[PDB]
């Protein structure tokens, strides 16, 4: 019964690192009904819709094609959720293929497995630049 | 033992762990050999 | 049932109206064992602890004084998470006694009740500012 | 069968969910409190 | 043949009906080439400049921002114009982001698309308050 | 000198300055502005409570224009907003102040479309004509 | 604590400083930058007035940089970009002065391209150098 | 299979043709992935921006004005790179919009499109003048 | 970790809320906001139309305060602006509804001036207090 | 000594026949450390910064531009302050470039000038409209 | 004499002209048709 | 004597308030023998010529359409003149039913008349706007 | 005992150690109403 | 001894205490060698000099108008120097009379005074806003 | 004895010259005890660790690697501290390898050989940039 | 065959029209006045 | 009354000396209605824009805001014009922010003050790099 | 029609162009562009490795400028910029390539100082004349 | 006594202060090191 706040803390970590050290390995943090959005736009100019599912999740990724992808954490806050889930804000700036930082808007919401001790993970993941929005 | 998304404990610090080299010099070779000028 | 989405912009609507209309009545929107983290600023600086239960969200929500809050509100984003549960994002501006508006995010996540059906209630509720960590 | 636009019928009244309640808010409570008042 | 009364009572419910909850979708109601005009957004307020076009229409909705917009119809009237068109002017109270009730009028013009009986779009939507003219 | 059509905001200034003066001056040839199919309320109340209904004709618009007999009524319009509409005619939205035999001011909503003559070219009639005083209905 | 890989400008000039500190301090253990197909070319001119050609492996680096047997040499870089390209590696582009054996500062313009290892991660090699001096071009 | 210093005379003749002749078709020598940085002017001419994919290069090269660019290559070296690629960098004299003689250097990667044999685009392209940095 | 001390904007809003605060739960404990040449006004009308005078001390305040019932009274603040005045003291503009006893919510206008006690740091009583509902005077 | 209902009667009657007269000489009532904030001027017209000083006092009056502002006073109570300063508050209707009549707080602090008896500067100076807030 | 900021006795009295007109307008007509009416 | 500044600002205030106002009366500041010339560019973009004598200027006034005319006069020089006359330069903002402001400056020579004394008549007015010149 | 300037051991604090208070209400007592309500 | 740091850190906090609390108090800070420069403008612009001795600092800081300033300190870095003495950098913003805060650079060198232990006096400071220089 | 403003003016081109030129001969400016921060980020982020020691500044220079380190001066102060010592405050821009200009502040301690007249050596050297800490 | 990006066999040496003269110039002198000259 | 050439000589070694200690009391040297240009670069670098008087001309010098200018003069040429003044035309080398030696020319008209005899001041001053034309 | 006399570029343009159009085509009308107190220098270099001394005469002048002989010479400005100075005269600066005779062309150094004439409005004559060769000099 | 502007016979040879070093350097070195290269 570890704290949020930490394990928060640690999958930020976790995640951000393998960001950019391998992206394409990034599928293996989500699940079955596992949401994902990364702050697209189309011709309508209206945000990108999320996808479901692993597979869709890891096409979505590829399809974005971070490439070392540097990322400065300004604020992670992790709260406790039902069965016992976390709840994880992420306020930062993130840059893409070293090009200019832009801010960047994170929620987590990360589920046990139910199996291991201290196992989870990704339900919900919603990202979103600054500038596509405000 | 925390881990998550279905990776092992320490996957990722092992993953990570390594340094930037170049050649075949061992981290700080280089500094190594310039420490003998003042 | 009604789709995440439909009950993250209700939600939304109805709790950024109420916060400007009726801020003392805020703490009905929330039950036992809830977060409320709406701050960011405390005596040493760092972003500000939470409150749990109705009593001490309502106390916070009262200490914040919400004088006129005119929100604006840029984007809402909903899904479904773990326990038929809702996760909502919503990025935006607010004002305080109508001074200038300030860039934020608010995430929501509202958990079902057990006995009403298509009943929703603020398990975690999450704010932040820009000026705060930017 | 009235629609404007490429609205199918009934869209937005699926829209609108007048039973979506919460927290302990009786059905349109909260616009009581807000409307004229 | 529907009664252009009974149209535009119809218009009138949807229409603030779709503005009071989902902003988004007003463009929905436009066409092409349709007019849109309104109180006006500038650095002074003053010259209010008509967009045309479903994107740009959906663009000057977004910007000018409406939430939580309550609107009490004092007043509509209903009447037949060319090519079988409809004229709506309506007299009410609205009070966008909680403000007061300000007095406005608001004149629609709608025409059928032709492809589907009893169908009718916003061809021309002139919107004012009384505060800034009179 | 480029010949130019009016623009559609220009017919409808213009055609609101002919119609309050007009109406101001010669209130019994304010009927030649509308054509056959014309519609128009103006301020109406019948004995109910509720506004007047719409009436559909040259004629009887005139009749109805009899029926208010203005005399020296006093006319300050404040807005006056013309874009262009199906067949080519324009759509007005009017507002001001009208005052008849010099009671007080009164503010008033009006809506007007107009539509092409079709023999003579710029050549409009009062199609659609919407007049309601603001304490009639608030 | 996130563990981010270098960012190709920070490798290449993390490189570019390697480089030219172990030129300076160690010419003879330079060749060991080098892989088996790695092409050099360092400022050369052969006996005809042309620029000399380039060696393309470990062991001919070795024996061209004992060939010419650099010592004491100062080095002053004055510009280097370096980008992201195929295959995981980096282009580096170096401008500055170089001095070899303290005679005067000689301009000097360089293009490195570097590949990763394979085996150990961020562990990178020299695989191309193009090294002229602006008196033996210009 | 042809030579890499072949390859890279001819890459080197044809760019600085299609640049004196076409500057604006320049961008048909560039795919998606490609890097182009060339000189710069953000405040005073130092903050270099590397610009991706056809479109922005295109873009870059209009807002860099190539009129009537006369180039006499002093010097090209080619050499052979990673999947089978080409590596070429040349110096010489640059005068844009017929000023003076300028130094310059210009380093291109080249790789292989796969479609087609002896087929080559410009995935890195780094140009610099010699003036404004010594 | 600086102390500092309130801003006047601060003094302002945080002086507003538990004065309504306090007068919503505990009207009679209203006095102990002022001093002893306090000068206090709440929404008066004598028997002539016109807006009622005002009490000039502590006593006087209680006396009002007790005169009118105040009790289970729901007050809704749209507007605080507080600036610095003479002597450190802070000037305070309220805007907001009333409602007493569970009547209809009124709009009212209020100012309120406060000085600094003296004896003790960070310590203001109200020195004017202006409240009038604008419905007696509009 | 002037009672101070007397000099708020003066006060008031003398600022506001100036203020319809000629706007430039309303700084003339204002001293030196003065603070003065009168309704919102910015992109949104919410937050308006007050502005001390004669000469930013002056600047900010010109900037609003005052032209037939006609103000009628429906109510004004003065009462004395420290340093036998005066506090009058006014309630009216305010109608500038020819508008309608907008309901109005004013906030008078003025204080003895000491080098003349029944001598008083503009201190302080808030203003507020009716439409702003509620 | 009571006065405020820098003015002297009446400065704003003779500033104000009530007999200024112009054109054929009574003294304070234009006034009494702007307010009210 | 009232002082040439004073009855110009009381003029400029009069003229632009009856302007704004009572459009239809603005005939009578003028008297027998008074240009105006007032307006736009001709069919060939000439400037327009003078209209002279009350009836003239009543019909050139009539024909301007002034609805809703909002002045936000930025100066007023006054000048005594011949013939115990006053001029006056004016600079100065419009809106014309309430279209975007624009740039103007116009001239008054206001004579004195010869039976009523402290009385003018507007002899003179040369109207003119900036973006129909420059 | 650090102190600056001339200032006695901490005076600054001492000088600076006061909550903000309206009328007779030492801090805390608005709260205890206010604790009365749910 | 303590850690210079510390000390360091400890007079910031203490500094700016005064500085908002109490700025006539400032003066006591300084010894009779003491330096102070506070960016004042004037003239051509150039920034003001310095100024030197206990009673020309109190004299400087009294004029300088220092009412409820508002400090939030971003960096502070102490070290040691000649006799024990310690040198600290400041970065932040500054806010006076409540107004919009500004970036501020600050200076300041504390010695002992030689008798009393762990007592320091600020021998010598130096400020500057960001705007009066960049 | 030169003047202080003298000393600080000629160190300040000195040192910023020396920069640029030769970076790693930098080292000969320091001596014993020196402390040396010019540094950017940690693990923390905030804070640098200082080095002391003609070698340890020699080793961070050559880690900190400046190639062709353009400086701009806005602003130099050099004041007198204890045993005769310049304390000089440093405002400006850096370009380090012709990359977009930062503004910084740098904090020089100078102090004197008792052996040679008019020798100056860095006692302490603070260097910090304006997006660091902001 | 050898090309780049996607020109054909000889694209632009086809584009290159060297035989194209404008006024009184000879086919190059335009070129030859503006080089080394 | 000295050699033309001796005063320009004396002028151009001063001047340039000046130049390379303190830009900062360049403007020194010229006085009223004195004209200065130098290179330029208002949104191009092309608009060279003549500034005049002793605050312009400081101005100018601090924006261009040399810093250990170096100069290395080739030749001097000094002659004698109207009113006892000197025409000096200057041809060097200049570098910049320790740039490399770039060829320019810098002409003087010095005119006599009058009130002190062998006093000159830089009536015109007109400097051009070699570079920016051919 | 205001007459507006030539601003002080304009005639700096007007006289460069008509000095360099004389020179090119009737060298020998040059002299004329000068008055008796007219200094001169046109691209010295004395027998010593120094640049050659002024000529300080309007009949020396011209014998100067037939001793550097000038035929079919030509010349190509590349700048010119005019400013106003003392005594109402304009100070000019040019810089430009020049060939004479047919040699290469030789980047060239010039410097004006004009004077007006006093007699006749509008009237220069070239007070100062310093030009160099580029090549002569660095 | 040639001087320009409001300059003293003597104010920037005195402001230039050639004997000034700092660190170990020697007098000018530091120029001469920046200048030569």
Redesign the interface.
């Known amino acids: 019964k570890?704290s949020p706040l930490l394990?928060g803390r640690?999958?930020v970590?976790?995640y951000?690192?393998?960001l950019?050290?391998?992206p394409d390995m990034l599928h293996?943090?989500?699940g079955k009904?596992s949401?994902y959005?990364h702050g697209g736009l189309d011709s309508?100019?209206?945000?990108a819709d999320?996808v479901y599912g692993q597979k869709e999740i890891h096409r979505k990724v590829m399809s974005q094609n971070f490439?070392?992808?540097?990322?400065k954490?300004?604020?992670v806050?992790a709260?406790?959720?039902?069965?016992d889930?976390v709840?994880v804000?992420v306020?930062g700036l993130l840059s893409n293929?070293?090009?200019?930082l832009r801010?960047f808007?994170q929620?987590f919401?990360?589920?046990p497995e139910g199996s291991?001790?201290?196992?989870?993970?990704?339900?919900?993941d919603?990202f979103?630049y600054?500038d596509e929005?405000? | 033992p925390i881990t998550f998304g279905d990776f092992n404990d320490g996957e990722i610090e092992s993953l990570s762990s390594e340094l930037l080299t170049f050649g075949d010099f061992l981290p700080g070779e280089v500094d190594d050999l310039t420490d003998s000028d003042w």
């Open positions: 570890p394990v640690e999958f970590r976790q951000y690192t393998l950019n050290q391998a293996r943090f989500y009904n949401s959005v309508n100019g209206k945000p999320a490439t070392n992808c540097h990322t954490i300004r604020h806050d709260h406790a959720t039902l069965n889930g709840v804000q306020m293929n070293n090009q200019a801010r808007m929620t919401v990360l589920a291991v001790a201290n196992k989870f993970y990704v339900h919900n919603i979103r600054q929005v405000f």
